[PDB]
């Protein structure tokens, strides 16, 4: 009626997540370039005079309601 479809989709997503983590954890060839979008200058103004880089992830979106 409702249960099994939603439950099974989320369980499959969890299974694929475990597969991804297990794949990148061992990998048997020593590739360390698992990082994401890069050291973007997030703010550049810490409470001190220094700057910050955070290994950010980009997401783009559209909103027509202002």
Ligand X SMILES: CCCCCCCCCCCCC(=O)O[C@@H](COC(=O)CCC)COP(=O)(O)O[C@H]1[C@H](O)[C@@H](O)[C@@H](O)[C@@H](O)[C@@H]1O
Binding region for ligand X (CB under 6 A): 11, 14-15, 18
CB of 10 to its own copies, least distance (A): 16
The one among 31, 34, 60, 61 contacting its own copies by CB under 8 A: 60
CA dihedral angle for residue 13, residue 18, residue 19, residue 25, rounded to 10 degrees: 150
Residue 57 in the binding site for its own copies (CB under 8 A): no
In the 8-state DSSP scheme, what is residue 48?
S
Name which of ligand X, its own copies, none residue 4 binds, using a CB cut-off of 5 to 8 Å depending on partner kind: its own copies
Alpha-carbon separation of residue 32 from 16, 37, 44, 52 (angstroms): 21, 15, 27, 22
Q: For binding to its own copies (CB under 8 A), which residues are involved?
A: 1, 4-5, 60, 64-65
């Amino acid at each position: 009626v409702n249960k099994i479809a939603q439950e099974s989709k989320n369980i499959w997503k969890l299974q694929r997540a475990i597969t991804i983590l297990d794949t990148e954890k061992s990998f048997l060839k020593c590739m360390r370039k698992a990082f994401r979008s890069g050291k973007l200058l997030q703010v550049g103004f810490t409470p001190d005079g220094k700057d910050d880089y955070r290994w950010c992830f980009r997401v783009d979106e559209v909103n027509w309601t202002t």
